[PDB]
Design a protein around this ligand. Structure first.
Ligand code: A1ILH
Ligand code: CL
Length: 167
């Protein structure tokens, strides 16, 4: 039947202590290639992915960035496609808190890194691909946000202790 947009979860920890769960709707109807990458990295089904990775940069009143599961600092990451992949489209905009969007280093350089907005970031429209939104647990993202700083260094270690796909 009809494709149902996937739901994925992250169970977040702070210095190894459970914080709570954030779940996301992935807009596979609009950005299928991008949604699928994040979905598969969340389940780990290719043999690599987000489980155990950290949020390396958190700037309160802006965004939380993660997904660098290879180098843990924003210098690494890889997609499920064997290479960075293209910007699918820019249909969806950075409208406010909870938007899930791809990090990149130029046109057509999507890997695994992503960010969760904690504010409207409209200046990123048209250059970062929006592919999902927080469904439940925006309060958990707001709690994470408190451990960021102006320059984005976190004051506690913020990890994805577990992640996967929901019904
Ligand atoms: C611009 C950045 N890109 C990267 O982090 C990439 C990842 C490349 C992995 N191979 N990495 C990159 O683009 C490079 C580094 C970017 C960098 C490093 C530290 C930063 C500290 C703060 C900020 N931006 C920063 C950007 C603020 C202004 N913006 C952001 O943090 C945005 C918010 C939206 C998501 N995002 N970062 C990115 O996509 C390193 O690789 C070559 O181009 C620049
Ligand atoms: Cl990446």
């Amino acid at each position: 039947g009809h494709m149902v947009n996937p739901t994925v979860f992250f169970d977040i920890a702070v210095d190894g202590e459970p914080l709570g769960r954030v779940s996301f709707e992935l807009f596979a109807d609009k950005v299928p290639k991008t949604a699928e990458n994040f979905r598969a990295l969340s389940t780990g089904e290719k043999g690599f992915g987000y489980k155990g990775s950290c949020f390396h940069r958190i700037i309160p009143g802006f965004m939380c960035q993660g997904g660098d599961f290879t180098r843990h600092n924003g210098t690494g990451g890889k997609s499920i496609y064997g290479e960075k992949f293209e910007d699918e489209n820019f249909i969806l905009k950075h409208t406010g808190p909870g938007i899930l969007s791809m990090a990149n280093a130029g046109p057509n350089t999507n890997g695994s890194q992503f960010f969760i907005c904690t504010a409207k970031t409209e200046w990123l429209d048209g250059k970062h691909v929006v592919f999902g939104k927080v469904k439940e647990g925006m309060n958990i993202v707001e709690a994470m946000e408190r451990f960021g700083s102006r320059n984005g260094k976190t004051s506690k270690k913020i990890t994805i202790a577990d992640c996967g796909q929901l019904e």
